[PDB]
Amino acid sequence: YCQHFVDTGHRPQNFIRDVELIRLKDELIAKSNTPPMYLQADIEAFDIRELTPKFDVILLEPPLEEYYRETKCWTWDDIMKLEIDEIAAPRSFIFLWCGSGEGLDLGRVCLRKWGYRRCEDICWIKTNKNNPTKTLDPKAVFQRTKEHCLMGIKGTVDIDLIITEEPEIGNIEKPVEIFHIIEHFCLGRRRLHLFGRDSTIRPGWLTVGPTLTNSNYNAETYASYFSAPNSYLTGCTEEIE
Amino acid sequence: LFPPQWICCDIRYLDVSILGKFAVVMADPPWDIHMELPYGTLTDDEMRRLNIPVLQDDGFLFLWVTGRAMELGRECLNLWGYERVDEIIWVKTNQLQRIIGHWLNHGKEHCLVGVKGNPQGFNQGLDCDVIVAEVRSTSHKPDEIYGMIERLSPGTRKIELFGRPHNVQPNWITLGNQLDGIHLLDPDVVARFKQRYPDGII
Numbered sequence: 209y210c211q212h213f214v215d216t217g218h219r220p221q222n223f224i225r226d227v228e229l230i231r232l233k234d235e236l237i238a239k240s241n242t243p244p245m246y247l248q249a250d251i252e253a254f255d256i257r258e259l260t261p262k263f264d265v266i267l268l269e270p271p272l273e274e275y276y277r278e279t280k281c282w283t284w285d286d287i288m289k290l291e292i293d294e295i296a297a298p299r300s301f302i303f304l305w306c307g308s309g310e311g312l313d314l315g316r317v318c319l320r321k322w323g324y325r326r327c328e329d330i331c332w333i334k335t336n337k338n339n340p341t342k343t344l345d346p347k348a349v350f351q352r353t354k355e356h357c358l359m360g361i362k363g364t365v366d367i368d369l370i371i372t373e374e375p376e377i378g379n380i381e382k383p384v385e386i387f388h389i390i391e392h393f394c395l396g397r398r399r400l401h402l403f404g405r406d407s408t409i410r411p412g413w414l415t416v417g418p419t420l421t422n423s424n425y426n427a428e429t430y431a432s433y434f435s436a437p438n439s440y441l442t443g444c445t446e447e448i449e
Numbered sequence: 450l451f452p453p454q455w456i457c458c459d460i461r462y463l464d465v466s467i468l469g470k471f472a473v474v475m476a477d478p479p480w481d482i483h484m485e486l487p488y489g490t491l492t493d494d495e496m497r498r499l500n501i502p503v504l505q506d507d508g509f510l511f512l513w514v515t516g517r518a519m520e521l522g523r524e525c526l527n528l529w530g531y532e533r534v535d536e537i538i539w540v541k542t543n544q545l546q547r548i549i550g551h552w553l554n555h556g557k558e559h560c561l562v563g564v565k566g567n568p569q570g571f572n573q574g575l576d577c578d579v580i581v582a583e584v585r586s587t588s589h590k591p592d593e594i595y596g597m598i599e600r601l602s603p604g605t606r607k608i609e610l611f612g613r614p615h616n617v618q619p620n621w622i623t624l625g626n627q628l629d630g631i632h633l634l635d636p637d638v639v640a641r642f643k644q645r646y647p648d649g650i651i
């Protein structure tokens with residue numbers, strides 16, 4: 209299929225097909241989810257400490273310069289300085305979007321800097337079914353057709369692939385499938401998405417980002433969702449009655 | 450000498466300086482990843498110590514990884530003097546083109562790509578960083594990786610470390626401890642081998 213792509217412009221992933229019922233789990237996540245909360249914040253300029261309590265999951269989607277190789281970017285220099293360890297629960301999880309270049313190394317440095325081990329490498333493979341080429345990074349050896357989302361754990365069902373079609377040039381949205389994978393893990397209910405946008409806001413999630421146009425965040429209102437007897441729920445069990 | 454060539458040996462103890470310089474190196478090491486052992490592994494220090502740096506002046510290294518070797522493999526890649534510039538992932542399917550650590554089921558295998566020096570005259574950007582292919586045999590790598598490498602650097606000298614019999618390819622020299630003897634055809638190589646090993650034993 210690699211010879212075929214050299215022949216026709218169809219990436220090998222174009223030809224994957226298919227891309228019992230854990231529908232009960234999907235409903236128990238839904239009932240357990242906190243109301244969506246969101247806050248606009250210049251995360252560069254923002255003390256990540258006012259974000260309390262400590263988070264069970266962190267989804268970290270900083271805007272890389274490479275996402276605009278066709279149309280404020282964050283360098284890995286800037287990301288590596290975010291005090292992520294200060295707001296992570298002692299046992300918690302990070303998913304970090306790393307792009308496909310230096311990020312795959314620098315992102316591993318970040319995970320180690322903030323105290324996580326890499327357990328999963330979730331790979332977003334982009335088909336080009338609707339437009340069978342790409343201008344390459346100077347160091348590139350091959351055409352880049354995927355992005356990596358690194359999963360880290362600190363402390364004591366699904367596949368590691370997402371297959372969608374490549375988004376329209378200068379559309380930076382990441383597949384919503386990432387959220388399903390995270391939710392299906394049942395890692396806890398204090399969930400933070402840093403650098404979310406209006407379009408990513410979502411039940412069971414606290415979104416913080418420079419481009420949000422409205423905020424509803426209140427730390428005391430947020431903390432009330434996890435006060436006893438709800439402090440330790442996986443996000444996958446029944447509500448305590 | 451274009452046809453297949455191989456050397457049965459222990460890559461730990463072979464003096465690879467006799468082999469010359471290659472445009473591409475490939476390795477699929479038996480990393481001591483998680484516990485147990487279906488084959489014979491190498492310790493992290495033994496992997497660090499492998500004399501990869503002598504095999505190339507300018508060119509590309511391809512390095513299969515898995516589990517914690519994704520970090521370890523990056524360390525060897527950096528220590529041996531490469532910059533990692535791509536990463537190929539093989540998506541494992543069946544004959545019907547459907548997809549086949551402990552948190553997530555593993556639908557893929559990673560191969561790191563490194564560069565040393567300043568390679569020139571390579572057809573960069575021909576293939577893309579994804580491979581889709583049926584899982585022929587367990588613990589085998591997809592034959593497509595050879596096609597991608599030939600298109601990138603056609604006609605050049607290539608060397609595979611920790612290969613097995615099925616891996617022998619034209620333009621390649623395969624090293625592994627399961628190969629049948631020493632089959633060498635390139636004159637310059639045969640010379641340096643006979644010089645270093647007059648009695649034929651590593």
Ligand SMILES: CNc1cc(N2CCC3(CC2)CN(c2ccc(CN4CCC(C)(C)CC4)cc2)CC(=O)N3)ncn1
Nearest residue numbers: 459460477478479488513558588589590611612625626
């Ligand atoms: C002690 N020193 C040695 C040792 C040695 N060999 C010869 C060849 C060798 C290992 C020992 C390959 N091996 C093996 C198995 C699995 C993996 C993991 N890989 C599987 C393929 C992939 C999924 C694409 C990517 C992940 C890697 C290697 C099994 C085997 O039987 N032999 N040769 C010389 N000196």
